[PDB]
């Protein structure tokens, strides 16, 4: 059966592949089996390492006798298996969204179909030909053929599922020969249209097993908890190949025998065992029993968790309690290895998720490696395990009845592989945009096979209802209705493409207060940018369209909560504060009493305490710590903090701020002792005519120069802007000020940017109608300007008037009243842009920080007095965009390291930004290396500023979060300052 | 053996430190294949290159220099070039006075002279190689005279047992160790010992015993004047591997000193500023028996007598194992 085009056939899905079983390794003893290292077992031989590899641009030009035993493979290349070959110098990298990157012609794939040939020799001992020998491939992209000793043994297909073959007629003692042909495209490519980078090769593990002639073939363990969760029964359905005497023993998490049994199973039969008082599994107390099976020379080890998942009245429940699932989606993606993921890179992701209050993970669009679920059983996470099926089509392969055996086996091979994992709670039938007759066959087989778990399918005997990207109004419409008999699960809500997810508090404010809402999964965990060099040596992360690949879906791959080197964005901190399991609210804060709500499902608050702090303008007055917390899950405690308002209020007579931070008390495996889970803040209510004679004014060529006692300010009367600001001779502006109504567009601004650029807001200028200056009878200077903002084709955008005022001490006050045109969508911002000279490097402000915040993304910042540098204001995204703005600033000082600068105040709190990049530099740049750092410091003082939102996919920006206001006043005040003596 | 760690941590926020900040730590010790793979062992010799193949390994020794040249495991190469013995470190800033005696005695660069080499095969398909050697530079009497026994077993372990004496009128050596060079891509270090940072025989009060995992770029401490850095005293075992976990594991009879860098000792000696260091693609791994400490000999007293390497007869007892770390 050599090359009869089985990869375009659809009636030949495999040749000689063994049927699917669970995941286990035969060991030799219980001591070796508890280590987990399968290479220590004498029944297992690895085949990872260094193989001989040859790459072909087509399957046409492959030699016809490469698989023979006496061929010379010495001039071939050498490749380390496991690895994807797109990250090893072979064919160019390619990212594609929901479109197929092949012509939609089922079941045919292009004639230029790239191929790879693998050759590896191995040895085999004498006591191995007396038994059965199997080969296991944990994962190969697309399809592959197989030859052992020059003889055809198998063909298989299916990229994310293992494949096992029987090698007993083919191997002999001594040297052997293994040859694999791997193709890039098969007829299963139509069912694997995932929005991910497309890799190829043998990318997972490969090994050989030696199982004796009568062996345990399949094991399915079943916890059988009673109706009140008080009696347990382990039912171990064992399916053998003959007559076996089987020993079985069961142990608790403490390591104590609770059961032991012997049976004689002749092909299919169970071994029930009783557990009187069971310890249950959940995400925050992951308790696991141990099962040891012994048969002949083989010892099998399983880890059992007792749980029950159900729906009662439209309310999702785990172990009797109502649980809200708080999770993210996750692709297997490494920035240097592709889809080859080592173990420590999984453990780092799990620790970083667990220290950000996450308890659910959805395996996005394919099943992962079998040891990721072994880790998720131990750390504690709820797993929604999706099948490898994404027929984005567009047609309708779902309704084509001769595709049905392809649809069904991708669920059969998944469910049979992962059925003994205590963390999987929901079987999901893959990404669905079309209701079809082939998805319901998958759901019916899965529901007939496994009844202990719920079944998910998106297109919609259904278990739960699912929605991708609702509005916040839509789910509170769904919750209040009476025709809603199923709970609602947010499938892929709050797309995190760009500068963090907007309006994330809005979803959880209505998830918490309502039942019939079981939580959800935020779009992505990571950015998929791949690590790339430039010809200058300033290595960056590239996205799609940087390798000549067609088609390009460029920045659609980034959309994550962490950087590709696993640094957190500000979007993790928003999520961490939103889904925190402890709430604190006010209980007549004047006395000092507080309500503490427990939002755990199974844990009391005995491991937590509250550290409180009173401060005024960022300066601490009193502090302390409470004893401990005691609240049972779902219950409210009252705490009392011993601070004193008599001493504190009689200090400076200002508003005081209390901060209460919930900090843990013991070392977790992911965090240390004093690590903080949540924070909550609370408000507490509590020169004589000597320098007016040095004021001189003159005007030449429209330049109004105003000198005073220790300052000199130069205004340009014909443009209505200050040009020079001095204090003790020190220059403080580098060039002319302006008004600015443009920001660098975010990735959540892909739809509104076409209206902004079509309306001409990309670059506007200023037109001064009339300018007039006076001198008030207190030696104060007023300048009145009538202006207009306009671009070069259309009606002017903003019409207004401004009053500049210079006082005897040197302050510059601005009062601009402006109206904007009525048929204009909404402006990005409105503000004053200044440019301060070289050397301005310190920022010190009183407001919300220490990082970025907006009108809708501000849940992770707290009020205080912060001091940092201009290089730390910047957040270097992969796609350069607007960054570094601090909402609700009270005052801010931008100065040099010796403290010579400007101070900015306003009537009501403003938005503040300081960068080394202007907005046009961030707009014009497309990668990180294209940004040239300016010597100056661009300071911007915004009145309002439109928020981020999540408008990359889903709903648009909300109405109170837009800048839809057409008449406003601004009221800014600028003061030159020498900060060390003021 | 069990280890108890007691860390003194504060309880309230100071103006300089947070709640759970640590002041001190104290640690305490608490006391508590059947003749199947010996038939795949093949040995040959051409041009002085002794090649030993086994069940899943292949090792190439150079008999005329007494050193392994190639170490393989499942076809994966694990050495980039020839091993050597090393008795030179990049001198520290507390070594301004002893460096003149080291450079005057010719310890700056020494070579190896093999007197006699002989290989056998033990009656369990185990290979022994006996080497009589000497370390010497090009004007003076030889420094170290000794003999080494390399041993390759049926699983692929490489055992070294070198007994060495050193010359009587020589001040004290900087180190004595085995230097290996592992190929491009070896980036993870995982060791059980004192860490997580550098430690010596006299500068070791700030490190604690544990199981640490880091990268080779984090082993390095970039001083202003480039000098010796990154060595971990009293290591029990250590694994240097790639990010997928394909590498070598090093054990010994008594705990050794361990170093892993992207810079050889002559690169750190010849450089004078930080920008002059060119990063190598390979990974230089060094397994030291003893190593002379830092001291404070820039100004004041010299290095103390129990902190010097003043010992003229010793045994070394190293063991090297090829490993695929994710399944062992």
Please say whether the beta carbons of A228 and A262 come within 8 A.
no
Q: B56 touching A, CB under 8 A? A: yes
Sign of CA dihedral A408, A409, A410, A413: positive
Q: A121: distance to nearest CA of chain B, Å?
A: 10
Contacts of B40 in chain A (CB under 8 A): 123
CA atoms within 13 A on the CB side of A440: 11
Kindly state whether A634 is in contact with chain B, defined as any CB-CB distance less than 8 angstroms. no
**CB-based contact (8 Å) between B326 and chain A?**
yes
Is the C-alpha dihedral spanning A364, A185, A191, A449 positive or negative? negative
Q: Coil, helix or strand for A383?
A: strand
Structural tokens at position A176: 């052997």
**Closest to A39 (Cβ–Cβ): which among B76, B77, B328?**
B328
* Pairing status of strand A696-700 against strand A676-684: unpaired
- Alpha-carbon gap, residue A85 to A57, rounded angstroms: 13
Nearest 5°: the CA angle A197, A107, A104 is: 60
Out of B19, B326, B328, name the one closest to residue A663 (CB): B19
d(CA A844, CA A842): 7
Separation between Cα atoms, residue A977 and residue A903, nearest integer Å:
7
**Cβ of residue A935 closer than 8 Å to a chain B Cβ:** no
The residues, ordered by sequence, that sit 6+ positions from A616 with a Cβ below 8 Å of its Cβ are A648, A651, A652, A654, A655, A656, A657
Please provide the size of chain B in residues: 328
Comparing C-alpha atoms, which of A745, A750, A748, A737 is closest to residue A761?
A: A745
The residues, ordered by sequence, that sit 6+ positions from A748 with a Cβ below 8 Å of its Cβ are A495, A497, A498, A499, A502, A948, A949, A950, A951, A952, A957
Show the tokens assigned to A315: 């309310």
Residue B213 CA from chain centroid, whole number: 17
Residue of B74, B186, B323 to mutate for A, most A C-beta atoms under 10 A: B74
Beta partners for residue A285, in sequence order: none
Token pair belonging to B155? 């699983």
CB contact under 8 A, A340 and B73: no
Measuring CA to CA, which residue among A297, A97, A110, A116 is closest to residue A187? A110
Helix (H) or strand (E) holding A540: strand A540-542
Give the Å distances, CA to CA, from A621 to A146, A651, A654, A693, A889.
Answer: 75, 10, 13, 43, 22
Beta strand A765-773 pairing with A781-790: antiparallel
Structure tokens at A627: 């004893």
Give CA angle at A724 (A718, A726), nearest 5°.
Answer: 150
State whether residue B59 sits within 8 Å of chain A by CB: no
Cα dihedral A144, A149, A151, A153, rounded to 10, equals -50
Query: Would residue A314 be called left, alpha or beta, if left means φ above 0 and alpha means ψ between -120 and 50 degrees?
Result: left
Secondary structure (3-state) at B103: helix
Angstrom distance (rounded) from CA A802 to CA A815 = 6
Residue A812 backbone phi and psi in degrees, to 5: -120, 115
Closest approach of B80 to chain A, Cα-based (Å): 16
Which residues, in sequence order, are CB contacts of A74 under 8 Å at separation 6+?
Answer: none
The encoded tokens of residue B287 equal: 């397994």
CA distance A656 to chain B (A): 19
Please give the Cα distance from B243 to A348 (Å, whole number). 14
CA distance A123 to chain B (A): 7
Torsion of CA B121, B123, B124, B128, to 10 degrees: -30
Specify whether the CB–CB gap between A704 and A697 falls below 8 A: yes
For A:27-46, CB contacts with B below 8 A are: 35, 37-40, 42, 46
Contact between B21 and B7 (Cβ < 8 Å): no
Interstrand relation of A900-906 and A972-978 (parallel, antiparallel or unpaired): antiparallel
Half-sphere exposure of A245 (CA within 13 A, CB side): 2
CA A666 from centroid of its chain's CA atoms: 28
Those residues whose C-beta lies under 8 Å from the C-beta of residue B105, and which sit 6 or more positions away, are: B140, B170, B171
Question: What does DSSP assign to residue A189?
Answer: G
CA A314/CA A488 separation, integer angstroms: 9
Q: How many residues does chain A have?
A: 982
Residues in A touching B11 (Cβ below 8 Å)? 625
Min Cα distance B197 → chain A (Å) is 19
For residue A255, count CB atoms less than 10 angstroms from its CB and return exposed for 0-12, middle for 13-18, buried for 19 or more. Answer: exposed
- Resolution for this PDB entry, in angstroms: 2.8
Task: Identify which of A48, A340, A675 has the shortest CB distance to residue B324.
Answer: A48
Tell me the sheet residues that pair with A158: none
The DSSP result for A765-816, as a single string, is EEEEEEEEE--BTTTBEEEEEEEEEE-SSS--SEEEEEEEEE-SS--EEEEE
Three-state DSSP class for A239? strand
Pairwise CA distance, residues A690 & A701, whole Å: 31
Cα→Cα distances A634→A415, A599, A603, A646, Å = 35, 6, 10, 36
- Helix %, strand %, coil % of chain A (to 5): 10, 35, 50
User: Which residues does chain B have within 8 Å of residue A80's beta carbon, measured at their own beta carbons?
Assistant: 76, 244, 246
Which chain A residues touch B218 with a CB distance below 8 Å?
none
Task: Write the DSSP symbol of residue B122.
Answer: B
Transcribe A594-644 into DSSP letters: EEEEE--SS--STTEEEEEEEEETTEEEEEEE-----PPTT-EEEEE----
Nearest to B309 by CA among B296, B298, B295, B324: B295
Nearest by CB to B36, from A37, A50, A127: name it: A127
CB A499 within 8 A of CB A883: yes
H/E segment holding residue B266: helix B265-270
Q: Which of B20, B33, B40 sits opposite A42 (nearest CB)?
A: B33
Helix or strand (DSSP H, E) at B5: strand B2-9
Our CA angle for A444, A448, A449, nearest 5°, is: 115
Cross-chain Cβ contact A342/B13 below 8 Å: no
Buried/exposed A22-51: b ≥16 CB within 10 Å, e otherwise: bbbbbbeeeebbeeeebbebbbbbbbbbbb
- DSSP conformational letter for A763: S
From chain B, the residues in CB contact with A672 under 8 A are 20
- B156 interaction partners in chain A (CB closer than 8 Å): none
Nearest CA distance, A616 vs chain B (angstrom): 15
Flag if A49 and B75 touch (Cβ within 8 Å).
yes
Judging contacts by C-beta atoms under 8 Å, the chain B residues touching residue A120 are 75
Query: How far is the C-alpha of A383 from the C-alpha of A307, rounded, in Å?
Result: 13
Secondary structure string (H, E, C) spanning A883-918: CCCEEEECEEEEECCCCEEEEEEECCCEEEEEECCC
Q: How far apart are CA B317 and CA B149, in angstroms?
A: 10
Which of B74, B244, B328 lies closest to A342 in CB terms?
Answer: B244
**Does residue B213 sit at the A interface (CB-CB below 8 Å)?**
yes
Residue A385 tokens, joined: 């395990």
Question: Which of A335, A362, A525, A374 has the alpha carbon at shortest distance from A458?
Answer: A362
Q: In A351-373, which positions are buried (b, 16+ CB within 10 angstroms) versus exposed (e)?
A: ebbbbbbbbbbbbbbbbbbbbbb
Sole residue written with tokens 């190593």: B291
Query: Mind telling me how many Å the CA of A197 is from chain B's nearest CA?
Result: 21
Q: Which residues pair with B246 in a beta bridge?
A: B324
Query: Distance (Å, rounded) from C-alpha A490 to C-alpha A195?
Result: 20
- Name chain A contacts of B16, Cβ cutoff 8 Å: none
**Cα A654–Cα A659–Cα A661 angle in degrees, nearest 5:** 175
B73 neighbourhood in chain A, CB within 8 Å: 49
A174, A344, A626, A677: best to mutate for the B interface, most B CBs within 10 A: A344
Residue B228 Ramachandran class (φ > 0 left, ψ -120 to 50 alpha, else beta): beta
Any CB–CB contact under 8 A between B25 and chain A?
Answer: no
Of B55, B74, B243, the CB nearest to A48: B74
- Hey, how many other C-beta atoms are within 10 angstroms of the C-beta on A229? 14
Instruction: Give every CB contact of residue B55 below 8 A, 6+ residues apart in sequence.
Output: A123, B37, B40, B154
Judging contacts by C-beta atoms under 8 Å, the chain B residues touching residue A335 are none
One-character DSSP codes across A280-337: BP-SSS---EEEEEEETTEEEEEEE-B--EEESSS-EEETTEE--EEEEEE---BTTT
B67: left (phi over 0), alpha (psi -120 to 50) or beta: beta
Tell me which residue has tokens 């050495």.
B79
Give the C-alpha separation, A234 to A422, whole Å: 13
Selected residues 91-150 of chain B with any CB under 8 Å from a CB in chain A: none
Q: Tell me the count of A-B CB pairs closer than 8 A.
A: 78
Annotate A684-716 with three-state secondary structure: ECCCCCCCCCCCEEEEECCEEEEECCCEEEEEE
Any B CB within 8 A of A19 CB: no
Cβ(A427)–Cβ(A455) under 8 Å? yes
CB A869 within 8 A of CB A851: no
Check B324 against A46: CB less than 8 A apart. Answer: yes
Both tokens assigned to A640: 């009392």
Residue in chain B nearest A666 by alpha carbon: B20
Contacts of A400 (CB under 8 A, 6+ apart): A438
* Whether B9 and A342 lie within 8 Å, measured CB to CB: no
d(CA B185, CA A367): 29
- Phi, psi angle pair for A731, to nearest 5°: -75, 140
- Which among B12, B40, B246 has CB closest to A625? B12
Active-site residue numbers of A? 432, 492
Contact of A340 with chain B, judged by CB distance below 8 Å, is answered with yes
Integer Cα distance of A890 and A888 in angstroms? 6
Q: Which tokens is A507 given?
A: 């979803």
By CA distance, what is A661's nearest residue in B?
B19
Judge: A80–B246 Cβ closer than 8 Å, yes or no: yes
The contacts of residue A132 (CB under 8 Å, 6+ apart) are A166, A168, A210, A211, A212, A213, A215
Partners of residue B39 in chain A, C-beta under 8 Å: 126
Across the interface, whether the CB atoms of A673 and B9 are under 8 A apart is answered yes
| Residues 6+ away with beta carbon under 8 Å from A943 | A829, A830, A831, A910, A911, A968, A970
All residues of chain B having their beta carbon less than 8 Å from the beta carbon of residue A50 are: 74-77
Residue holding tokens 């990082």? Answer: A851
Nearest to B19 among A123, A344, A674 (CB): A674
Q: Using the beta-carbon criterion (under 8 Å), do B327 and A613 form an inter-chain contact?
A: no
Report the Cα A67 to chain-centroid distance in Å. Answer: 44
């Amino acid at each position: 059966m050599e090359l009869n085009r089985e990869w375009e056939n659809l009636s030949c899905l495999h040749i000689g592949r063994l049927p699917a079983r669970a995941s286990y390794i035969p060991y030799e003893s219980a001591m070796t089996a508890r280590t987990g290292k399968r290479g220590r077992s004498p029944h297992v031989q690895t085949l990872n390492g260094n193989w001989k590899f040859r790459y072909y641009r087509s399957v046409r030009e492959v030699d016809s006798h490469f698989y023979e035993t006496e061929t010379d493979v010495s001039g071939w290349d050498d490749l380390i298996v496991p690895s994807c070959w797109q990250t090893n110098g072979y064919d160019q990298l390619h990212y594609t969204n929901v479109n197929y990157p092949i012509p939609y012609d089922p079941p045919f794939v292009p004639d230029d179909n790239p191929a790879g040939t693998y050759v590896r020799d191995f040895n085999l001992p004498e006591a191995w030909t007396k038994k059965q020998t199997r080969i296991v491939f944990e994962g190969v992209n697309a399809c592959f053929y197989l030859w052992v000793n020059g003889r055809f043994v198998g063909y298989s297909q299916g990229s994310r599922i293992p494949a096992e073959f029987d090698l007993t007629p083919f191997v002999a003692a001594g040297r052997n020969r293994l040859a694999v042909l791997v193709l890039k495209w098969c007829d299963g490519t139509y069912l694997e249209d995932q929005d991910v980078w497309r890799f190829s090769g043998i990318y997972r593990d490969v090994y050989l097993l030696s199982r004796d002639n009568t062996h345990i073939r399949d094991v399915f363990n079943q916890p059988l908890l009673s109706d009140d969760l008080s009696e347990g029964k382990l039912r171990s359905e064992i399916e053998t190949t003959g007559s076996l005497t089987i020993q079985a023993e069961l142990r608790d998490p403490a390591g104590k025998l609770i059961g032991q049994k012997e049976a004689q199973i002749d092909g299919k039969g169970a071994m029930e065992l009783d557990v009187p008082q069971p310890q249950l599994w959940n995400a925050e107390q992951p308790r696991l029993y141990e099962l040891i099976l012994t048969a002949g020379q083989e010892v099998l080890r399983f880890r059992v968790g007792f749980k029950k998942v159900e729906i009662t009245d439209g309310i999702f429940r785990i172990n009797g309690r109502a649980v809200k699932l708080k999770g993210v989606n996750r692709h297997d993606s490494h920035p240097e290895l592709g889809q080859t993921i080592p173990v420590n890179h999984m453990i780092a992701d799990l620790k970083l998720m667990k220290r950000h209050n996450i308890n659910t993970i959805r395996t996005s669009h394919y099943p992962n490696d079998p040891k990721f679920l072994d880790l998720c059983d131990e750390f504690g996470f709820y797993i929604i395990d999706e099948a490898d099926l994404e027929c984005h089509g567009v047609h309708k392969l779902s309704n084509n009845p001769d595709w049905k055996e392809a649809f069904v086996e991708r669920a059969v091979r998944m469910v049979e592989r992962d059925k003994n994992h205590a963390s999987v709670i929901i079987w999901s039938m893959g990404n669905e945009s079309g209701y079809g007759d082939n998805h319901i066959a998958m759901a019916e087989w899965t529901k007939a096979r496994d009844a202990s778990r719920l079944v998910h399918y998106e297109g919609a005997c259904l278990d739960l209802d699912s929605r991708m990207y609702p509005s916040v109004k839509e789910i509170e419409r769904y919750a209040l209705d009476e025709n809603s008999t199923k709970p609602l699960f947010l499938c892929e809500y709050s797309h995190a493409m760009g500068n963090g997810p907007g309006d994330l508090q809005d979803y959880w404010n209505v998830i918490y207060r309502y039942p019939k809402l079981m939580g959800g999964c935020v779009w992505e965990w990571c950015d998929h940018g791949i690590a790339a060099e430039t010809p200058d040596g300033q290595r960056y992360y590239a996205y799609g369209g940087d390798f000549g690949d067609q088609p390009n879906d460029r920045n659609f791959c980034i959309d994550g909560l962490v950087f590709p080197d696993r640094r957190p964005h500000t979007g993790l901190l928003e999520l961490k504060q939103v889904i925190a399991p402890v709430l604190i609210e006010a209980e007549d804060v004047a006395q000092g009493r507080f309500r503490v709500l427990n939002r755990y499902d199974f844990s009391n608050l005995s491991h937590l305490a509250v550290s409180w702090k009173l401060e005024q303008e960022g300066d601490v007055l009193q502090q302390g710590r409470s004893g401990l917390l005691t609240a049972a899950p779902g219950e409210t405690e009252i705490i009392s903090l011993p601070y004193d308002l008599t001493v504190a209020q009689e200090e400076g007579t200002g508003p005081l701020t209390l901060t209460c931070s919930v900090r843990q008390q013991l070392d977790t495996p992911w965090a240390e002792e004093g690590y903080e889970i949540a924070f909550y803040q609370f408000e507490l209510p509590g020169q004589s005519e000597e320098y007016a004679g040095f004021m001189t004014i003159d005007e030449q060529d429209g330049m109004l120069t105003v000198r005073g006692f220790d300052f000199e300010h130069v205004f340009d009367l014909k443009k209505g802007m200050p040009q020079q600001v001095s204090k003790h001779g020190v220059p403080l502006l580098a060039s002319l000020a302006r008004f600015n109504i443009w920001r660098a567009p975010m990735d959540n601004d892909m739809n509104i940017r076409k209206e902004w650029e079509a309306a001409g807001l990309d670059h506007a200028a200023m037109k001064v109608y009339r300018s007039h200056w006076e001198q008030k009878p207190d030696a104060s200077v007023e300048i009145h300007v009538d202006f207009s903002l306009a671009s070069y084709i259309f009606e002017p955008f903003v019409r207004g008037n401004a009053v500049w005022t210079v006082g005897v001490s040197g302050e510059i006050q601005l009062k601009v009243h402006a109206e904007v045109r009525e048929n204009l969508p909404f402006l990005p911002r409105f503000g004053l842009e200044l440019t301060m000279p070289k050397g301005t490097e310190e920022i010190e402000y009183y407001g919300y920080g220490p990082h970025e915040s907006y009108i809708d993304k501000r849940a992770s910042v707290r009020k205080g007095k912060y001091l940092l540098s201009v290089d730390d204001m910047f957040e270097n995204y992969v796609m350069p965009q607007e960054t570094g703005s601090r909402y609700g600033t009270e005052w801010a000082i931008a100065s040099t390291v010796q403290g010579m600068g400007l101070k900015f105040t306003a009537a009501q709190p403003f938005s503040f930004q300081a960068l080394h990049y202007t907005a046009e530099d961030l707009t014009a740049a497309q990668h990180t290396y294209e940004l040239k750092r300016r010597p100056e410091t661009i300071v911007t003082l915004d009145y309002q500023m439109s928020g981020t939102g999540s408008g990359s996919c889903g709903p648009q920006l909300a109405e109170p979060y837009r800048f839809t206001e057409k008449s406003f006043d601004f009221e800014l005040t600028i003061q030159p300052i020498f900060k060390e003596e003021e």
